[PDB]
From Swiss-Prot, chain A:
Its main location: cytoplasm. This is Proteasome subunit alpha type-3. Pfam families: Proteasome, Proteasome_A_N. The lineage of its organism: Eukaryota, Metazoa, Chordata, Craniata, Vertebrata. The 26S proteasome consists of a 20S proteasome core and two 19S regulatory subunits. The 20S proteasome core is a barrel-shaped complex made of 28 subunits that are arranged in four stacked rings. The two outer rings are each formed by seven alpha subunits, and the two inner rings are formed by seven beta subunits. The proteolytic activity is exerted by three beta-subunits PSMB5, PSMB6 and PSMB7. Interacts with AURKB. Interacts with CDKN1A. Interacts with MDM2 and RB1. Interacts with the C-terminus of TBXA2R isoform 2. Interacts with DNAJB2. SUPFAM superfamilies: N-terminal nucleophile aminohydrolases (Ntn hydrolases). GO terms for molecular function: ubiquitin protein ligase binding. It is found in: Cytoplasm; Nucleus. One of its GO terms (cellular component) is nucleoplasm. InterPro entries: Ntn_hydrolases_N, Proteasome_alpha, Proteasome_alpha-type, Proteasome_asu_N, Proteasome_sua/b. The modification Phosphoserine is found at residue 238. PROSITE patterns: PROTEASOME_ALPHA_1, PROTEASOME_ALPHA_2. Belongs to the peptidase T1A family.
Curated annotation (Swiss-Prot), chain C:
GO terms for cellular component: cytoplasm; cytosol; extracellular exosome; extracellular region; ficolin-1-rich granule lumen; membrane; nucleoplasm; proteasome accessory complex. There is a cross-link at residue 76 (Glycyl lysine isopeptide (Lys-Gly) (interchain with G-Cter in SUMO2)). It is linked to Stankiewicz-Isidor syndrome: A neurodevelopmental disorder characterized by delayed psychomotor development, intellectual disability, behavioral disorders, mild dysmorphism, ophthalmologic anomalies, feeding difficulties, deafness, and variable congenital malformations of the cardiac and/or urogenital systems. Belongs to the proteasome subunit p55 family. The keyword Methyltransferase does not apply. This is 26S proteasome non-ATPase regulatory subunit 12. It comes from the Eukaryota. One of its GO terms (biological process) is proteasome-mediated ubiquitin-dependent protein catabolic process. Transmembrane segments: none annotated. The keyword ATP-binding does not apply. There is a cross-link at residue 76 (Glycyl lysine isopeptide (Lys-Gly) (interchain with G-Cter in SUMO1)). Keywords: Acetylation, Intellectual disability, Isopeptide bond, Proteasome, Ubl conjugation. The chain holds residues 17 to 152 of 456 of the full protein.
Swiss-Prot record, chain D:
This is Proteasome subunit alpha type-6. Keywords: Acetylation, Cytoplasm, Glycoprotein, Nucleus, Phosphoprotein, Proteasome. The 26S proteasome consists of a 20S proteasome core and two 19S regulatory subunits. The 20S proteasome core is a barrel-shaped complex made of 28 subunits that are arranged in four stacked rings. The two outer rings are each formed by seven alpha subunits, and the two inner rings are formed by seven beta subunits. The proteolytic activity is exerted by three beta-subunits PSMB5, PSMB6 and PSMB7. Interacts with ALKBH4. GO terms for cellular component: cilium; cytoplasm; cytosol; extracellular exosome; mitochondrion; myofibril; nuclear matrix; nucleoplasm. The modification Phosphotyrosine is found at residue 154. The modification Phosphoserine is found at residues 12, 58-59. Belongs to the peptidase T1A family.
UniProtKB/Swiss-Prot annotation, chain E:
The 26S proteasome consists of a 20S proteasome core and two 19S regulatory subunits. The 20S proteasome core is a barrel-shaped complex made of 28 subunits that are arranged in four stacked rings. The two outer rings are each formed by seven alpha subunits, and the two inner rings are formed by seven beta subunits. The proteolytic activity is exerted by three beta-subunits PSMB5, PSMB6 and PSMB7. Component of the 20S core proteasome complex involved in the proteolytic degradation of most intracellular proteins. This complex plays numerous essential roles within the cell by associating with different regulatory particles. Associated with two 19S regulatory particles, forms the 26S proteasome and thus participates in the ATP-dependent degradation of ubiquitinated proteins. The keyword Acetylation applies. InterPro entries: Ntn_hydrolases_N (IPR029055), Proteasome_alpha (IPR050115), Proteasome_alpha-type (IPR023332), Proteasome_asu_N (IPR000426), Proteasome_sua/b (IPR001353). Keywords: Acetylation, Cytoplasm, Nucleus, Phosphoprotein, Proteasome. The modification N6-acetyllysine is found at residues 68, 169. The modification Phosphotyrosine is found at residues 4, 22, 74, 119. The lineage of its organism: Eukaryota, Metazoa, Chordata, Craniata, Vertebrata. One of its GO terms (biological process) is proteasome-mediated ubiquitin-dependent protein catabolic process. This is Proteasome subunit alpha type-2. It holds the Pfam family Proteasome_A_N. It is found in: Cytoplasm; Nucleus. It comes from Homo sapiens (Human).
Length: 240, 238, 136, 239, 232, 119
């Protein structure tokens, strides 16, 4: 109060409240998880179809920042799409400036700095979308990064962004992501997500997945429809 | 409370109250029903008239020969967004000499719409649009609420007293794909005539229909032009 | 946590036989070599058994210089466990009153005192060692 | 004592810039502490790496950054702002070398970094960066050097400094140390930094719970002691 | 004046620009510096006392040069000193390249003060909260000027900013004879600080510069130690 | 300030005025006979979590062994007031489950309940 109206004002205890609020608006989004397989990273996001009238696969949250990188925005969508467009302009300027794909770490650092660039001025508000980046490269392994609204970006073996962050790591913490090839991880990321999302609340939902690794040959494209079907079946059988 | 005067302030509960309010702009205008079949994109608008002897407000605008929109919100903003799309499509036609796909247009409308929600100096565009166009990947019906979020809709109904139009469409969504030109529109007019108060019934002056099809450009049917679609319309039970 | 119940049960007897000969060295060095294995494993018991074992072997062997050195060296180890370190102390002070030679005793009391100094787990044993220092 | 505060550009009646003041109180929100000790020919920075998850990619949770081949820095405070300050510095040095023909002395790199922070305190455009930087480098003609640039833009030459939640005792511990003048050998300095951080927190300092940086006159390069070495150093501290 | 205290571009009902005044409070609560103009030159002094032994006293120097014939001493927010000096050396330099003669100390303060006044004409820029003492020896006559955050530059013969300034001035007016010489002047300058520096005047605790006929120079720790030993 | 170092009666009563922010407190308030001793009490001591749990855990019947150590790291930065709840909230988990706490699995979730739900 008094210090909570402007992003540029420091509370006497020494913190930017505005950033905290935005990071605590991401808690009000759909759960998004990311697990990096031994030769890649997997992203599985719960999409809550808010009413039967949006066509299947609409306002999707799985974005392609560049050829090899991946985004899995979790939070206010409209802010996410904005963060997606900035990332691509950051990548596109990269490839044209340095002749090769922008490494995931550097794309996260520049994208993290841009996000932190909006939590410094009163004329702007901090982004309300915290997103996970995923990519795989024979020269760089697989990297997964979570850029929270405040500007911090450090990689996670497996992370979840949204309402069920704590619930999502707990069942992610019981997997040896270091080894299983994300051939078998997709069946695991999908299985995880169904554990979260208590049905009594939030009603219906839909699940979108994507992977980066050898399996994709270095891309991020969505898991082939065939693979998902069994994966959803595989997770469904785990009702008990 | 005190956090609800600027879009640039985060509420304690994690919401940007200004966008929530702009969202409230859509419901102010007269409801529009938007529904696409497998073969056409038809959107029906319930025009309003200021006075007894004043011409009724235009609700369906012309965005391009393959993209048309319905406005449910501010008059000034809807015009500003309509100007942008046409300029965007005009460059897209001029640059790539190809019809700019609806998905790419809707994405750009959101990006232009999202800047106001983040940088003080402008107000959220209080115009909710049902973007209807026919690209090479089939007919489409997009909607962009002022919060800069656009949902790919089978059929949507924004505007005053809209929830009735939605509830009819969700009840008849499955049949929508296998629709002929006239059957689809007779559904939509049925949707708009759900939104109308019991006393009001869809007249030739207050309903405007915009249909875009496989070999058809966006034709804005008004006044007599609406009658050919209106004619054959089923009477409301009562 | 790792636990060495059997190993401390097995390694100790062999070391005790060799130490009695007078070679010591290898016996003591090899035991402490496992101590790094135990200590780092959170195995107070075995260390307590091991830490006790090393002190007892020297005390029977009558190697005074090794005893004064060892309690100093074993005590100040990195992150050595509290109860085990304590277990080494009461055993030493139980050996304390057994030591009769004054210069040997005075060195023994001083070494036990310092290792215990400012140690909450071993204050009372420190008090008696101090008291035995006073009465000495 | 809130004051006019709510704006960084409006003085308190006593002559105290409260908004700038609140910057430092934001500095310890990182919950961690870094200590730099300058020896006879080396400077050692030790930080707290408290990784609160088994899922965190430990490789990228570092608080230590390499500003340049001869100057290494540790951030204490908000990770986001500390990152920007790191990135702004790197350009400032690279512009220094590219502009004058030589590597920027660690002396100025805190000055320019401080100067950048100072204008953010006058012109109410940028909210101040809430992180303190410590620059360590083997400076020719001046031996190893350490500097700590604060949110308000104050930098000083430190024989030893520490910033973080437990700064008052960390400096009091060091203040106790530096005074009983001793031959600060590279082993002595690295040991001194570890003891300082250990005593204040009261922790055993498992091998992976810290990130010790080292710069020496003999090999004027910024290096981060690999986890094997800290264990060797830590065991040396015990005995 | 109660609600008009904040903005620097809104006159109070009594015609008082308060914010400049509060900035002058930040000066009046800073490190004591003392200046004395002896007929042979200008001597400046300030206490460089650190908060613990952990600091490297030689790191940051307060008594500083601008050109070869001008120096500054400050009592206020440090970092706001540095931004002042740089625009001072640049301004002192920008004079040299254009006129090719060392900038007269009167002009430098006229333009080092006009630098200050720039930040006190708009909302969104805090006043420079560091009073400055400028010594120089130009045209064969020692000079000692004080430029303030308010933009007014004085022509002090001998003054002292910072904590306990009122007492320092009283010591002057007492032990200041317009006809001293630089050698005696340094003793007086040190003594004026001695009335407030809470501690022994260690050679790494007081930093003194002498603006004589040949030019300004920050006294090396020894020479002060030679001076401090004599006074004590 | 007056009622402390004040004419009237100096008295024999004592004051334990405790704050959360010591920089804010005015200098006069911290003086020899006007409120001295700045005793710092940081979040429960690393070993205390045990002792605190030791003093706050045992009361509730719980025959099952305890891996307290994991609860300690499962509870980093815990306010201690939270720790009191930890055991008590676990008792509610036990109040449902059955009637005797026989598993640390309880404190784990109890630790979570006294963390995410204690945020």
């Amino acid at each position: 109060t008094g210090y909570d109206l402007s992003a540029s004002t420091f509370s006497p205890d020494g913190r930017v409240f505005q950033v905290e609020y935005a990071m605590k608006a991401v808690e009000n989004s759909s759960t998004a998880i990311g697990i990096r397989c031994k030769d890649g990273v997997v992203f599985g996001v719960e999409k809550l179809v808010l009413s039967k009238l949006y066509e299947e696969g609409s306002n999707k949250r799985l974005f392609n920042v560049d050829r090899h990188v991946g985004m899995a925005v979790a939070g206010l969508l409209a802010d996410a799409r904005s963060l997606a467009d900035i990332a691509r302009e950051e990548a596109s300027n990269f490839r044209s400036n340095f002749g090769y794909n922008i490494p995931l770490k550097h794309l996260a650092d520049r994208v993290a700095m841009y996000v932190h660039a909006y939590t410094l001025y009163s004329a702007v508000r901090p982004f309300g979308c915290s997103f996970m980046l995923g990519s795989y490269s024979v020269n760089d392994g697989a990297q997964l990064y979570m850029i929270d609204p405040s500007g911090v970006s450090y990689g996670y073996w497996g992370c979840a962004i949204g309402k069920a962050r704590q619930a999502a790591k707990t069942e992610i913490e019981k997997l040896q992501m270091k080894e299983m090839t994300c051939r078998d991880i997709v069946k695991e990321v999908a299985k995880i997500i169904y554990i979260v999302h208590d049905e009594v609340k939030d009603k219906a939902f839909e699940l979108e997945l994507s992977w980066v690794g050898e399996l994709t040959n270095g891309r991020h494209e969505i898991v082939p429809k065939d693979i998902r079907e069994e994966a959803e079946k595989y997770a469904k059988e785990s009702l008990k | 409370n005190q956090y609800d005067n600027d879009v640039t302030v985060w509420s304690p509960q994690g919401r940007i109250h200004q966008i929530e309010y702009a969202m409230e702009a859509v419901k102010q205008g007269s409801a529009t029903v938007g529904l696409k079949s497998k073969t056409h994109a038809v959107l029906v608008a319930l025009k309003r008239a200021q006075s007894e002897l004043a011409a009724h407000q235009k609700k369906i605008l012309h965005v391009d020969n393959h993209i048309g929109i319905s406005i449910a919100g501010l008059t000034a903003d809807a015009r500003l967004l309509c100007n942008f799309m046409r300029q965007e499509c005009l460059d897209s036609r001029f640059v790539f000499d190809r019809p700019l796909p609806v998905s790419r247009l809707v994405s750009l409308i959101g990006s232009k719409t999202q800047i106001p929600t983040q940088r003080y100096g402008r107000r959220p565009y209080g115009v909710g649009l049902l973007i209807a166009g026919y690209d090479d990947m089939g007919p489409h019906i997009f909607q962009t609420c002022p919060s800069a979020n656009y949902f790919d809709c089978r059929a949507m109904s924004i505007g005053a007293r809209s929830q009735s139009a939605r509830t009819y469409l969700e009840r008849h969504m499955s049949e929508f794909m296998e629709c002929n030109l006239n059957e689809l529109v007779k559904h939509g007019l049925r949707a708009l005539r759900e939104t109308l108060p019991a006393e009001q019934d869809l007249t030739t002056k207050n309903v405007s229909i915009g249909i875009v099809g496989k070999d058809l450009e966006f034709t804005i049917y008004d006044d007599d032009d609406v009658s050919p679609f209106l004619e054959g319309l089923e009477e409301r039970p009562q | 946590e790792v636990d060495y119940s059997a190993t401390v049960d097995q390694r100790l007897p062999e070391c005790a036989k060799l130490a009695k000969e007078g070679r010591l060295q290898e016996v003591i060095e090899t035991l402490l070599s496992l101590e790094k294995q135990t200590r780092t494993a959170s195995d107070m018991v075995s260390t307590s058994r091991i830490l006790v074992a090393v002190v007892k072997m020297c005390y029977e062997a009558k190697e005074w210089d090794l005893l004064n050195e060892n309690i100093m060296l074993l005590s100040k180890r990195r992150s050595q466990l509290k109860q085990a370190v304590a277990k080494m102390v009461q055993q030493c002070c139980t050996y304390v009153e057994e030591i009769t030679d004054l210069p040997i005793k005075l060195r023994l009391i001083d070494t036990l005192r310092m290792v215990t100094e400012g140690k909450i787990y071993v204050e009372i044993e420190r008090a008696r060692l101090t008291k035995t220092l006073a009465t000495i | 004592s809130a004051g006019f505060d709510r704006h960084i550009t409006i003085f308190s009646p006593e002559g105290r810039l409260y908004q700038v003041e609140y910057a430092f109180k934001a500095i310890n929100q990182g919950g961690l502490t870094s200590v730099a000790v300058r020896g006879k020919d080396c400077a050692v920075i030790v930080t707290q790496k408290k990784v609160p998850d088994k899922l965190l990619d430990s490789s990228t949770v570092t608080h230590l950054f390499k500003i340049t081949e001869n100057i290494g820095c540790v951030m204490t405070g908000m990770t986001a702002d500390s990152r920007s300050q790191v990135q702004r510095a790197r350009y400032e040095a690279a512009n220094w070398k590219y502009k004058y023909g030589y590597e920027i002395p660690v002396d100025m790199l805190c000055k320019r970094i401080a100067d950048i922070s100072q204008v953010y305190t006058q012109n109410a455009e940028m909210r101040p960066l809430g992180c303190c930087m410590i620059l360590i480098g083997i400076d020719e003609e001046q031996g190893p050097q350490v500097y700590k640039c604060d949110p308000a833009g104050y930098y000083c030459g430190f024989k030893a400094t520490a910033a973080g939640v437990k700064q008052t005792e960390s400096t009091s511990f060091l203040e106790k140390k530096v005074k009983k003048k001793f031959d600060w050998t590279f082993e002595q300095t690295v040991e001194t930094a570890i003891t300082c951080l250990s005593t204040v927190l009261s922790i055993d300092f498992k091998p992976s719970e810290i990130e010790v940086g080292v710069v020496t006159v003999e090999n004027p390069k910024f290096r981060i002691l690999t986890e094997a070495e800290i264990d060797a150093h830590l065991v040396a501290l015990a005995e | 004046e109660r609600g008009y205290s904040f903005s620097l571009t809104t006159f109070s009902p009594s015609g008082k620009l308060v914010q400049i005044e509060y900035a002058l409070a930040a000066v009046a609560g800073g490190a004591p510096s003392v200046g004395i103009k002896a007929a042979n030159g200008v001597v400046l002094a300030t206490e460089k006392k650190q908060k613990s032994i952990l600091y490297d006293e030689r790191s940051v120097h307060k008594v500083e040069p601008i050109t070869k014939h001008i120096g500054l001493v400050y009592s206020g927010m440090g970092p706001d000193y540095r931004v002042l000096v740089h625009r001072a050396r640049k301004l002192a330099q920008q004079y040299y390249l254009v006129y090719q003669e060392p900038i007269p100390t009167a002009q430098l303060v006229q333009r080092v003060a006009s630098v200050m006044q720039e930040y006190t004409q708009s909302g969104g820029v805090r006043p420079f909260g560091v009073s400055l003492l400028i010594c120089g020896w130009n045209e064969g006559r020692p000079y000692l000027f004080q430029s303030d955050p308010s933009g007014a530059y004085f022509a002090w013969k001998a003054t002292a900013m910072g904590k306990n300034y009122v007492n320092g001035k009283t010591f002057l007016e007492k032990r200041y004879n317009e006809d001293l010489e630089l050698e005696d002047a340094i003793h007086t300058a040190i003594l004026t600080l001695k009335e407030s520096f809470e501690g022994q005047m260690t050679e790494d605790n007081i930093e003194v510069g002498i603006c004589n006929e040949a030019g300004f120079r920050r006294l090396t720790p020894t020479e002060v130690k030679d001076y401090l030993a004599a006074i004590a | 300030l007056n009622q402390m170092d004040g004419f009237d009666t100096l008295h024999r009563v004592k004051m334990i005025m405790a704050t959360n922010r010591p920089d804010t407190l005015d200098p006069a308030l911290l003086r020899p006979g006007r409120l001295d001793r700045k005793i710092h009490i940081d979040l429960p001591n690393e070993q205390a979590r045990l002792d605190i749990l030791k003093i706050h855990a045992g009361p509730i019947t719980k025959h099952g062994e305890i891996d307290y150590e994991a609860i300690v790291k499962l509870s980093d930065g815990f306010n201690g007031a939270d720790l009191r709840n930890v055991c008590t909230e676990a008792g509610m988990f036990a109040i449902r489950a059955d009637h005797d706490f026989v598993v640390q699995e309880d404190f784990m979730k109890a630790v979570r309940k006294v963390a995410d739900s204690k945020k």
